[PDB]
Amino acid sequence: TLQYRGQFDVVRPVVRKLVSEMRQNPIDVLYRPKDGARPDAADVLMGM
Amino acid sequence: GSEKDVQLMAEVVDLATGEKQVLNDIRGRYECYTDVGPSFQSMKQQNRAEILELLGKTPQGTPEYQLLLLQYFTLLDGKGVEMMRDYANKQLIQMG
Amino acid sequence: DLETYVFQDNLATAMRRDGEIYQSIVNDIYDVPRNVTITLED
Numbered sequence A: 001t002l003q004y005r006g007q008f009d010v011v012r013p014v015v016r017k018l019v020s021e022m023r024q025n026p027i028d029v030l031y032r033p034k035d036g037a038r039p040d041a042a043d044v045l046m047g048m
Numbered sequence B: 001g002s003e004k005d006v007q008l009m010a011e012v013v014d015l016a017t018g019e020k021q022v023l024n025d026i027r028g029r030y031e032c033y034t035d036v037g038p039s040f041q042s043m044k045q046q047n048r049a050e051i052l053e054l055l056g057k058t059p060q061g062t063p064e065y066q067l068l069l070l071q072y073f074t075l076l077d078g079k080g081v082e083m084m085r086d087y088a089n090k091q092l093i094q095m096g
Numbered sequence C: 001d002l003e004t005y006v007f008q009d010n011l012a013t014a015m016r017r018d019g020e021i022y023q024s025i026v027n028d029i030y031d032v033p034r035n036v037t038i039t040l041e042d
Helices: A012-023 B043-057 B063-073 B083-094 C005-029
Strands: B011-013 B020-022
Touching: A012 C005, B011 B020, B043 B063, B063 B083
Parallel strands: none
Antiparallel strands: none
């Protein structure tokens, strides 16, 4: 049968706020040399 | 030579098989107690944090502040920051 | 920050794509000059 079926959402703004908050803080991998190695061991690998 | 930390090690092979054998003295086994502190990832980060703390506790316009600044600068990692590391090492060596 | 930060990021991605396309078209159409130094003593 056909009846009225509305959609009054209240949860989408929360998801939008969370994704906007997580998009404002980018995260990437940083290579650092081991303690016993040279200071510059992670230069070429980081550039690559 | 005064205060030479040789870091002597002792290892012996069985001469009957390729496997090695460890040699740890009993007298000097338990000589450092465990404690709880902040979590780091390498021994250089710990030294960097301690130098930062000492800088925070040291007032400005003092030779100790300059020594701490140079000690912090000579602990960086990146190759882009190499000018400052070399300059700090040279200054620390030339000050004796 | 702003309310439209996600839309700004999407526009930035589209602009990066546009820049890639424009760079390719320039390489295949225009005359890009090559920079070279003689390194003469004078």
